[PDB]
From a paper:
In summary, the structure and electrochemical properties of MtoD are consistent with its possible role as an electron shuttle between MtoAB on the outer membrane and a range of potential electron acceptors on the inner membrane. Further analysis of the sedimentation data gave a f/fo coefficient of 1.24, indicating that MtoD behaved like a monomeric globular protein in solution.
The crystal structure of MtoD was solved to an initial resolution of 2.29 Å by single wavelength anomalous dispersion (SAD) using the anomalous signal caused by the single iron atom contained within the heme group. The crystal structure contained residues 28–119 of the processed amino acid sequence and a single c-type heme covalently attached to Cys43 and Cys46 via thioether bonds, consistent with the histidine ligands predicted from the sequence alignment. One obvious difference is that the axial coordination of the MtoD heme is bis-Histidine, while other crystallized cytochromes have Histidine/Methionine coordination. The class 1 cytochromes typically contain a flexible loop that covers the front of the heme, however in MtoD this region is restrained by a hydrogen bonding network that causes the formation of a β-loop and prevents the peptide sidechains from interacting with the heme propionate groups. This causes an increase in the overall surface exposure of the MtoD heme, giving an overall exposed heme of 152 Å2 compared to 30–61 Å2 for other class 1 cytochromes. The measured redox potential of +155 mV for the MtoD heme is high for a bis-His coordinated heme and the heme group is significantly more solvent exposed than in monoheme cytochromes. Previous studies on the potentials of the heme groups of MtoA indicate that they span a mid-point potential range between +30 and −350 mV, which is lower than the potential of MtoD and indicates that electron transfer from MtoA to MtoD would be thermodynamically favorable. This supports the hypothesis that MtoD could be the electron transfer shuttle between the outer membrane MtoAB complex and the cytochrome bb3 oxidase on the cytoplasmic membrane, allowing the efficient generation of a PMF.
Numbering used by the authors: 28 to 119
């Protein structure tokens, strides 16, 4: 079961909410929209764990790109999984 407080704590600590809201878009997509994009995908969790631990290109609204925030080695595997699992749940 997702630990919601631990997920939101990890997000705060790693600047995630500076660019993402739960329901409101900012620099990055809302997590509700992400959850919708990935709803049902069998490999959703692995894909988002990959996304947050690789630093691949992230295209911004104004057209510029940056390597995405990479938290590999900055928290535990269990904490990262729990944060992904929280995100994926936010479609409802
Ligand atoms: C602003 C500087 C950002 C910070 C800090 C973080 N994210 Fe981000 N993220 C951002 C952008 C601009 C995008 C869109 C990239 C694109 O090319 O479309 C994203 C995307 C995500 C996603 C969706 C990935 C996908 O496969 O659809 C997730 C789940 C996500 N970002 C999570 C996330 C987390 C957990 C962060 C803190 C560790 C974080 N982001 C920081 C911009 C920014």
């Amino acid at each position: 079961a997702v630990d919601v407080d631990a997920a939101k704590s990890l997000a705060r600590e790693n600047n995630c909410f500076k660019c993402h809201g739960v329901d409101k878009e900012k620099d990055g997509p809302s997590y509700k929209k992400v959850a919708e994009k990935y709803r049902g995908k069998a490999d959703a969790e692995a894909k988002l764990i990959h996304h947050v631990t690789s630093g691949e290109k992230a295209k911004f609204p104004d057209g510029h790109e940056e390597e995405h925030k990479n938290i590999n080695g900055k928290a535990s595997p269990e904490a990262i999984k729990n944060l992904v699992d929280w995100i994926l749940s936010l479609w409802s």
